């Protein structure tokens, strides 16, 4: 009998583990690994893709959990649909980061989209996602999608009055995608009625960055509003996103009917959740100075 | 010893590992020191210090409270039903031996009597000595601590309470626990007055989706008004916690008066008027699981 | 570009770990994993082969460490060379277990060997070793080596007065040991790994008792094993007359024409010196 | 609380992780209970209970002693040089705050005075209160416990000790030990595992051999130390570890020995080829 002929379904045991340390290295999440699908190193970072019995395929960058098959929909739907539904007719979209493709997948559900550019700094992330993260990279081959390997901060400044929507995802490191000038470049790249959303992390372990991102975005966009969503495998489980625009109000200019009549599948986002996500608990309001 | 001792600094050698349902995922926390470890005839108690979370209280290896974030859980479990009741004077809290829910309930000036029914006396004694942030209301003149099984205790009353809150109880028993039966919920209904309200922690709709569904289903078979609300809980499994509000007529949205919250004379670190209403907005996957799509 | 074109040398971090529990499940060893080379499941057990920054390639069966590139020589040399050098002229050797091939590799270093049979119960272990554990499986290609996929306890019973040396690299009953005795020639020798007299004291004592009831000469020897539970490994030498000390000719070792990274004439004799606690467990002193 | 407390039973939630040099491999242990956690101006002390190993003592996350096997280390470090000396009366032990080595040294009736020099006073006090198995010799009239830096302390003596044991590294320090010893004095020092700590092992041997005319490495099993293969370095001004060893002294020993014996003494000096190669002896 040959090697392949002798192989059987791999059963999970209690010897292989993935440890994700949170900011501060005092708390973290651990996951059992049934098998490791891919481990690669680029000039930028390390990529690991493995299988967990409960969460399915897990994608991590430098030991930080990026996506989980069981719950990535929670994150991608909130990051993408809030600004997409708020825009009156989103045709040209720019997504910075999001090498896994999840945000692109959600953006492509909107029929108005004519072109969606996915700007990823690491080519190895795109190649690994295309081969091993099928659930999220399914939009890579869509004719409306254009994948560009570049630093988002450098790429966005090449455009002026070009995009309807700009979304900043979390897969791209920079030790650049969070400076006031970067947000100003995003503002300038957007059209007069353009909208924006950026993942702004957990107001718990990453409170310092959360406050900094809000402050910087607010210095550029007249409308800057934080919204929250559950993210069952991200640090603390309380994730924040920051919606921004040149005038469109996330509550006052929201049309629930657009969501109710939507012709695509949504596993998290809905009209009540859109409005509810903008309600901030007292401790978050205090951190942002919103009383 | 004492003369040679200095401030204890954390290293990378002591850890607390918490396993979630299914045992495939969990949370780990660094321990600067173990404050107390005790074993009762019911369960094991461990209280330790984490550099970021502060004092952590665990029962049988399950995180119950953390100093840094317990307010998120206790405020949502207590304030939703308390603010919805017209004039809550008599309140019964089952479980929650740490005292957090009692502390929040006592913030309401209308309260004349609040009973905390805890099954394990060792939890109460440990909370007094080591969990002062949550046990601060134990000695309030309006408070009464009773050491008994909640399912048996509640049956002794009829048309007695304005509010009944079911906090954490027997976490290792899961959905098969005594405080998750239709009989128990019916006893709660019977112990409540004609216009009484109720709230119960109903787990995370992720790792414990089945338990969550069972609790909602059984509560809904007893109370005419049953509504799930959600809240962040930064150190509980998945971070997405659910609670179930129930009543004999009072609607959590139609009968909510934001002015009661705006004019509240006590500190609130999580709960507010907007959060109250927002907590009842359920994501699609939750609605589908409850048959509300 | 393509995947391979963008790939660089993989650097270890603090997120991937292998945890091995010792008997009792109260103590264990953990290792950082730079990458996992192979994970497979047979009808018998699970195989995992991964890379550790300090130990190199590590091979584990059901979460139990079997071999590491950095120190496997310590175990394989002590298990094989003690009985091999003690035999007057070892020509036919039977190895039960040892699917990684390390013991076979050491046995083949002896020029007198004409045939060495490696009897492994799991064919997938042999295939994985051939493909991923070249350091230990290099002997698979030797014309004198014969790999047999079979249950060792059932296999050895098919032979009588056949082998010069029998090595147990893994199969614990007195009946099994008697079968080994019967399969050996009149002047045959035997060795078996008998675990650590610490976490596995129970098995250690049982193995010694059963082997000693069958063989006239039964002596325990010890060796360092830097990645096995406790680091104190025991082996049991047995024969039908050959004494491991009195009949040892150090010149055979001194003049050996092959590389030895652990075993030598001084270590051979020294390995038979047992600490008091071990002697007490065996009922010696 | 007192009336409600019961026997504390172990679970799978409290753990001790000990990282080995390099931080790529380590040992983990279940902790049923933590007995003591303290911090001195020098280091952190942790004493806890493991279901299989019993009481475990760690310094800065490094395992120092285990109730189940500490005898292996303490007996090999102390008895090899003690039995090799003709009549050991004055002994100096540098380090070993737990007291295990002192306990073993005191078993020899010939000892009149044994000085235990520990740098951290908190270790001595913690050992006296929580590590009774090893600190049992603290009150012996022949024992003298001093709190000081061993490197500076040994310099106060010249031609004073019969035996010097290092239970804890410059050529200058080893020369001071040589000078503190009498004309026929013996020496022993723990020299780590020739695996994860190969660098330290080689350095210690080189430095000791440059001072003492007779320097020989011996090995011993240590079931809870990194790799399980522990080395010790014997040194003297003429006494040979093998040639001058009298097995009768060990056979007639009127005290308990759980590891050390006459055959083990001789066997411990047999070094595997890889160790000989690292020491330049091959």
- Residue A37 belongs to a domain with what CATH number? 2.30.140.10
A54·B281 Cβ contact <8 A: no
- For residue C106, what is the enclosing H or E element? helix C102-107
Please give, one letter per residue, the 3-state secondary structure of chain D: CCCCCCCCCCCCCEEEEEECCCCCEEEEEECCEEEEEEECCCCEEEEEEECCCEEEEEECCEEEEECCCHHHHHHHHHHHHHHHCCCCCEEEEEECCCCHHHHHHCCCCCCCEEEEEECCHHHHHHHHHHCCCCHHHCCCCCEEEEECCHHHHHHHCCCCEEEEEEECCCHHHHHHHHHHEEEEEEEEEECCCCCCCHHHHHHHHHHHHHHCCEEEEEEEECCCCCCCEEEEEEEECCCCCCCCCCHHHHHCCCCCCCCCCHHHHHHCCCCCHHHHHHCCCC
Q: How far is C53 from chain A (nearest CA, A)?
A: 15
Q: How far is B197 from chain D (nearest CA, A)?
A: 34
What's the CA gap between C65 and C58, in Å, rounded? Answer: 7
Q: How far is B188 from chain A (nearest CA, A)?
A: 30
Q: Write out chain D residues lying below 8 Å of B31, CB-based.
A: 14
Instruction: State whether residue C82 is helix, strand or coil.
Output: helix
Measured CA distances, A246 to A183, A194, A250, D18, D199 (Å): 13, 7, 11, 55, 64
Considering only CA atoms, give the Rg of chain A.
19
Residues in CB range of D226: below 8 A, 6 or more apart: D20, D21, D27, D193, D195, D196, D197
| Binding-site entries of A for S-methyl-5'-thioadenosine | 45, 120, 151-152
> Contact at 8 Å (CB) between B236 and B201?
no
What the block records as the tokens of B116 is 């905390």
**Closest A-chain CA to B21:** A54
Instruction: Tell whether D125 and D138 lie within a shared domain.
Output: yes
Is A291 an 8 Å CB contact of chain C?
no
| Residue D47 β-bridge partners | D36, D57
For this entry, resolution in Å reads 1.5
**Hunting for tokens 């040992």 — which residue is that?**
D27
Number of Cα atoms under 13 Å in the Cβ half of residue A277: 32
Q: Are strands D25-30 and D229-236 parallel, antiparallel or unpaired?
A: unpaired
Q: Please tell me which residue in A48, A71, A169, A202 is annotated as part of the active site.
A: A169
**Closest B-chain CA to A230:** B240
Q: CA torsion, points C17, C20, C24, C26, in degrees to nearest 10?
A: -30
Rounded to 10°, the helix B209-222/B182-191 angle is: 40
Instruction: Tell whether D236 and D119 lie within a shared domain.
Output: yes
| Binding-site entries of C for S-methyl-5'-thioadenosine | 45, 120, 151-152
Q: Write out chain C residues lying below 8 Å of A21, CB-based.
A: 14-15
CA B61, B65, B67, B69 dihedral sign is positive
Instruction: Tell whether A206 and A218 lie within a shared domain.
Output: yes
What the block records as the tokens of D180 is 């503190």
What the block records as the tokens of D4 is 């409600």
Measured CA distances, D122 to B35, D98, D128 (Å): 20, 11, 10
Residues in CB range of D168: below 8 A, 6 or more apart: D94, D95, D96, D150, D190
For A:52-91, CB contacts with C below 8 A are: 60, 62-63
CA C261 to chain centre: 15
Is C253 an 8 Å CB contact of chain D?
no
Question: Comparing C-alpha atoms, which of B14, B12, B123, B15 is closest to residue B60?
Answer: B123
- For residue C77, what is the enclosing H or E element? helix C72-86
Domain that holds residue B172: 65-293
Instruction: State whether residue C41 is helix, strand or coil.
Output: strand
Is C29 an 8 Å CB contact of chain D?
yes
What's the CA gap between B202 and B228, in Å, rounded? Answer: 9
Q: b vs e for D21-51, b when ≥16 Cβ sit within 10 Å of the residue's Cβ? A: beebbbbbbbbbbbbebbbbeebbbbbbbbe
What's the CA gap between C204 and C232, in Å, rounded? Answer: 12
A15·C43 Cβ contact <8 A: no
Q: How far is A136 from chain C (nearest CA, A)?
A: 18
Instruction: Tell whether A48 and A72 lie within a shared domain.
Output: no
What the block records as the tokens of D268 is 């411990």
> A with C: how many residue pairs have Cβ under 8 Å apart?
105
Instruction: Tell whether B105 and B234 lie within a shared domain.
Output: yes
Query: Within A17-122, where are the H helices?
Result: 72-86, 102-107
Please give, one letter per residue, the 3-state secondary structure of C239-252: ECCCCCCCCCCHHH
Q: What are the φ/ψ torsions at residue D234 (nearest 5 degrees)?
A: -95, 145
Which residue, C66, C87, C115, sits at the end of a domain? C66
E-strand spans in chain A? 16-21, 27-32, 35-41, 46-52, 56-61, 64-68, 92-96, 115-120, 145-149, 163-168, 190-201, 223-230, 238-245
Instruction: Tell whether D281 and D260 lie within a shared domain.
Output: yes
**Closest B-chain CA to A266:** B284
Is B207 an 8 Å CB contact of chain A?
yes
Instruction: State whether residue C104 is helix, strand or coil.
Output: helix
What the block records as the tokens of B8 is 């204890």
Give how many domains chain C has, as a whole number.
Answer: 2
Which residue, C66, C83, C105, sits at the end of a domain? C66
Instruction: Tell whether C51 and C188 lie within a shared domain.
Output: no
What the block records as the tokens of B214 is 């069972």
Question: Comparing C-alpha atoms, which of A121, A54, A107 is closest to residue A78?
Answer: A107
Question: Comparing C-alpha atoms, which of D241, D251, D256, D116 is closest to residue D188?
Answer: D241
Q: CA torsion, points C268, C270, C272, C276, in degrees to nearest 10?
A: -160
Chains contacting chain B through 3 or more C-beta pairs under 8 A: A, D
CA A219 to chain centre: 22
For B48-108, the DSSP string reads: EEETTTEEEEEETTEEEEETTTHHHHHHHHHHHHHHHSSS--EEEEES-TT-HHHHHHTTS
| Binding-site entries of A for spermidine | 76, 100, 169-172
What's the CA gap between D266 and D250, in Å, rounded? Answer: 12
> Contact at 8 Å (CB) between A94 and A163?
yes
Using alpha carbons only, what angle is made at residue D194 by residues D192 and D195, rounded to the nearest 5 degrees?
A: 110
Is B209 an 8 Å CB contact of chain A?
no
| Residue-level length of chain B | 293
What the block records as the tokens of A2 is 């040959």
Q: Which of A17, A30, A264, A284 to mutate to test the interface with B (most CBs of B within 10 A)?
A: A30
What the block records as the tokens of A251 is 């509550």
Instruction: State whether residue B284 is helix, strand or coil.
Output: helix
> Contact at 8 Å (CB) between B145 and B97?
no
Instruction: Tell whether A174 and A55 lie within a shared domain.
Output: no
**Closest C-chain CA to D14:** C26
Q: Is D167 a catalytic residue?
A: yes
Q: How far is A41 from chain B (nearest CA, A)?
A: 25
B25·A54 Cβ contact <8 A: yes
E-strand spans in B202-251? 225-232, 240-247
Instruction: Tell whether D143 and D237 lie within a shared domain.
Output: yes
Instruction: State whether residue A72 is helix, strand or coil.
Output: helix
Question: Comparing C-alpha atoms, which of A31, A35, A30 is closest to residue A11?
Answer: A35
Q: Which of A34, A229, A281 to mutate to test the interface with B (most CBs of B within 10 A)?
A: A281
**Closest C-chain CA to D268:** C270
Helix, strand, coil % in chain C, rounded to nearest 5:
30, 30, 40
Question: Comparing C-alpha atoms, which of B288, B243, B282, B239 is closest to residue B25?
Answer: B239
Which residue, B64, B86, B109, sits at the end of a domain? B64
What's the CA gap between A140 and D187, in Å, rounded? Answer: 72
Instruction: Tell whether A113 and A236 lie within a shared domain.
Output: yes
Q: Which of B13, B19, B21, B28 to mutate to test the interface with A (most CBs of A within 10 A)?
A: B28
Q: Which of A65, A230, A288 to mutate to test the interface with B (most CBs of B within 10 A)?
A: A230
What's the CA gap between B117 and B146, in Å, rounded? Answer: 5
List the single residue in B28, B207, B235 with the smallest CB-CB distance to A30.
Answer: B28
Residues in CB range of A36: below 8 A, 6 or more apart: A16, A48, A49, A50, A51, C16, C35, C36, C39
Burial of C141 (0-12, 13-18, 19+ CB in 10 A): exposed
Is C41 an 8 Å CB contact of chain A?
yes
What's the CA gap between B157 and A246, in Å, rounded? Answer: 59
What the block records as the tokens of C186 is 């009149």
What's the CA gap between B40 and D228, in Å, rounded? Answer: 39
Q: Write out chain A residues lying below 8 Å of B51, CB-based.
A: 24, 26
What the block records as the tokens of D134 is 């090893």
- For residue C202, what is the enclosing H or E element? helix C201-214
List the strands of the sheet with D33-39, edge to edge: D33-39, D44-50, D54-59, D62-66
What the block records as the tokens of B253 is 């949205």
What's the CA gap between C30 and D19, in Å, rounded? Answer: 9
D192 labelled binding-site residue: no
Number of Cα atoms under 13 Å in the Cβ half of residue D72: 26
Instruction: Tell whether A61 and A79 lie within a shared domain.
Output: no
Q: Write out chain C residues lying below 8 Å of D53, CB-based.
A: 26-27
Measured CA distances, D142 to B59, D99, D119, D153 (Å): 49, 14, 20, 19
Q: Are strands D113-118 and D143-147 parallel, antiparallel or unpaired?
A: parallel
Question: Comparing C-alpha atoms, which of A195, A241, A184, A176 is closest to residue A94?
Answer: A195
For B267, other C-beta atoms within 10 Å of its C-beta total 9
Residues in CB range of D56: below 8 A, 6 or more apart: D16, D29, D47, D48, D49, D50, D63, D65, D66, D67
B274·A280 Cβ contact <8 A: yes
Per the entry, the structure determination technique was X-ray
What the block records as the tokens of B74 is 């206790």
Query: Within chain B, where are the H helices?
Result: 70-84, 100-105, 121-130, 132-135, 150-153, 182-191, 209-222, 258-262, 273-278, 284-290
D22·C53 Cβ contact <8 A: yes
What's the CA gap between B283 and B281, in Å, rounded? Answer: 7
Query: Within A133-278, where are the H helices?
Result: 134-137, 152-156, 180-189, 207-218, 256-260, 271-276
What the block records as the tokens of C79 is 């298990």
What's the CA gap between A220 and A218, in Å, rounded? Answer: 5
What's the CA gap between D264 and D220, in Å, rounded? Answer: 9
> Contact at 8 Å (CB) between C191 and C236?
yes
C3·A127 Cβ contact <8 A: yes
Q: Write out chain D residues lying below 8 Å of C271, CB-based.
A: 267
Question: Comparing C-alpha atoms, which of A188, A198, A290 is closest to residue A246?
Answer: A188
Q: Please tell me which residue in C48, C71, C164, C169 is annotated as part of the active site.
A: C169
Q: What are the φ/ψ torsions at residue A228 (nearest 5 degrees)?
A: -120, 150
> Contact at 8 Å (CB) between C78 and C99?
no
- Residue C161 belongs to a domain with what CATH number? 3.40.50.150
Greatest Cα pair distance in chain B: 66
| Residue B90 β-bridge partners | B113
Chains contacting chain A through 3 or more C-beta pairs under 8 A: B, C
Question: Comparing C-alpha atoms, which of B170, B129, B131, B135 is closest to residue B149?
Answer: B170
What's the CA gap between A14 and C40, in Å, rounded? Answer: 15
What the block records as the tokens of A7 is 């192989």
Q: How far is B233 from chain D (nearest CA, A)?
A: 21
Instruction: Tell whether A147 and A286 lie within a shared domain.
Output: yes
């Amino acid at each position: 009998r040959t090697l392949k002929e002798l192989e059987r379904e791999l059963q999970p045991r209690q010897h292989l583990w993935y440890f994700e340390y949170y900011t501060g290295n005092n708390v973290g999440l651990f996951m059992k690994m049934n098998r490791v699908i891919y481990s690669g190193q680029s000039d930028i970072q390390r990529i690991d893709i493995f299988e967990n019995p409960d969460l399915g395929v897990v994608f991590a960058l430098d030991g930080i959990t990026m996506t989980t098959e069981k719950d990535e929909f929670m994150y991608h739907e909130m990051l993408a649909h809030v600004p997409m539904f708020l825009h009156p007719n989103p045709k040209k979209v720019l997504i910075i980061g999001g090498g896994d493709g999840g945000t692109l997948r959600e953006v492509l559900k909107h029929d108005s989209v004519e072109k969606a550019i996915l700007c990823e700094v690491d080519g190895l992330v795109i190649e690994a996602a295309r081969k091993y993260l099928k659930q999220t990279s399914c939009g890579f081959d869509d004719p409306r999608a254009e994948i560009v390997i570049a630093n988002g901060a450098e790429y966005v400044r090449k455009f002026k009055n070009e995009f309807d929507v700009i979304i900043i995802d979390s897969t791209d490191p920079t030790a650049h995608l969070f400076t006031e000038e970067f947000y100003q470049a995003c503002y300038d790249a957007l059209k007069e009625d353009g909208v924006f959303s950026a993942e702004t992390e957990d107001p718990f372990y990453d409170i310092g960055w959360f406050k900094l991102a809000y402050r910087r975005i607010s210095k550029v966009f007249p409308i800057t509003r934080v919204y929250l969503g559950f993210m069952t495998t991200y640090p603390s489980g309380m994730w924040s996103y920051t919606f921004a625009s040149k005038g469109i109000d996330p509550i006052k200019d929201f049309d629930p009917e657009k969501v109710r009549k939507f012709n695509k599948e949504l596993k998290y986002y809905n009209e009540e959740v859109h409005v509810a996500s903008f309600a901030l608990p007292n401790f978050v309001k205090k951190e942002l100075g919103l009383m």
